[PDB]
Amino acid sequence: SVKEFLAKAKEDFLKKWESPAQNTAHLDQFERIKTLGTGSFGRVMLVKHKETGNHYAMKILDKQKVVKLKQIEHTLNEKRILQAVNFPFLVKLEFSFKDNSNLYMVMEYVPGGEMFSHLRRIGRFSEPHARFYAAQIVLTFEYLHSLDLIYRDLKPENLLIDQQGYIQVTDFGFAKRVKGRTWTLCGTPEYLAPEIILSKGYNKAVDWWALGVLIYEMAAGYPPFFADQPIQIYEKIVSGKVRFPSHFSSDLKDLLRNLLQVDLTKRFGNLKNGVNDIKNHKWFATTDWIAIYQRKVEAPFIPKFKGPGDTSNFDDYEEEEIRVSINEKCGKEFSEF
Amino acid sequence: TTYADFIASGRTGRRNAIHD
Ligand SMILES: O=C(c1cccc(Cl)c1)[C@H]1CNC[C@@H]1c1ccc2c(=O)[nH]cnc2c1
């Protein structure tokens, strides 16, 4: 049944995986409005598609910067994976294309902003609020992992809240399809599993560890391992010690001890019963997984929405022109994009 | 309090990914 669903899902995913959509729009088809976020090798902007008037979020990557940061293959992974997946809590890729200078991915615009912004402002979420979001991640990971995908960058900065108050997972820049083990040091310091820090060779269990960090941060207001410098964060992560706020329920602590488990033969998500050890944990006893998947559960809050194109749920960023060189850069490197 | 220690730390803004 779940197995039945995942089978058809894999069948759909593979058709697209083997025959990726490519070159499905052009820069001039979009009016650029405002930067929604920005950092290494690119930015994401709110745009309007001229022929339809729809708004989208367009990620713009500078090919030369991608090459210097050694992110060529990770970028190809991101686009090939995003064009192939389909799940209610995964942001959709509607168009992609490239020009002499940049790569572009045009995604649904999610006007409610990042969970990060809301969580930092409110301080922490109640357990029922955190459980509502955590449930959607659990199902999204059940989906991605069944397609042999590892996501590798779970954090509130990468989770958007939509107009119904549900989560859309974005930022697939480190996602990878791999059977068996992989070794790349990537992720965000507060969310790395011990085996990534220790250069061990790792698999989807790192996403389940990251879910434990995320649930902790949502419910506490701060992550379980924090310091002023990454090295001190890593020393805390590998120590085997974790402390919980005194307001955490006993069921919540027990789930987190099993997720934030350094020993892989004991980490929930990674045992004989797979994701079911998580879905059937007492902390989730009230969660109706089907109702969540169907978006039938009432959300903890609906973001304020002041009209189409409104960005007030996003921070302001310095704006920079989109320059397109008269010469093609890095054509060979990104030919399959 | 742990919360006060977090709020006074330099890592309450958006966190960058790492890579080699
Ligand atoms: O700005 C971003 C980004 C992420 C990776 C590379 C570059 Cl260049 C930019 C991402 C970071 N976390 C979320 C942010 C973002 C913001 C809005 C949307 C959106 O409205 N639809 C889809 N994805 C988004 C991502």
What does this entry look like structurally?
The complex is a heterodimer of chains A (337) and B (20). With 337 residues, chain A is α+β, with helices and mostly antiparallel strands. Chain A is built from eleven helices and ten strands. Chain A has two domains: 2-19 and 114-304, Transferase(Phosphotransferase) domain 1 (Transferase(Phosphotransferase), domain 1, Orthogonal Bundle), CATH 1.10.510; 20-113 and 305-335, Phosphorylase Kinase, domain 1. In chain A, the strands form three sheets. Chain A has a five-stranded antiparallel β-sheet with strand order 1-2-3-5-4. A two-stranded antiparallel ribbon of chain A has the order 6-9. In chain A, strands 7-8 form a two-stranded antiparallel sheet. In chain A, strand 2 (42-49) and strand 3 (55-62) form a beta hairpin. In chain A, helix 7 runs antiparallel to helix 9. Chain B is α+β, with helices and mostly antiparallel strands. Chain B contains one helix and one strand, in the order αβ. The longest helix of chain B has 6 residues, at 2-7. Chain B is elongated. Strand 10 (186-187) of chain A pairs antiparallel with strand 1 (18-19) of chain B, so a sheet runs across the interface. Residues 36-37, 39, 41-44, 57, 59, 61, 91, 107-110, 114, 157-158, 160, 170-171, 173 of chain A line the site of the ligand O=C(c1cccc(Cl)c1)[C@H]1CNC[C@@H]1c1ccc2c(=O)[nH]cnc2c1. Chain B: Extremely potent competitive inhibitor of cAMP-dependent protein kinase activity, this protein interacts with the catalytic subunit of the enzyme after the cAMP-induced dissociation of its regulatory chains. Chain B: One of its GO terms (molecular function) is protein kinase A catalytic subunit binding. Chain B: Belongs to the PKI family.
The main pleated sheet of chain A reads as: 5 strands, antiparallel
Whole-angstrom Rg of chain A: 20 Å
Strand content of chain B: 5-15%
- Spatial strand sequence of the major β-sheet of chain A: 1-2-3-5-4
Calculate the terminal CA-CA distance of chain A, rounded to whole Å.
35 Å
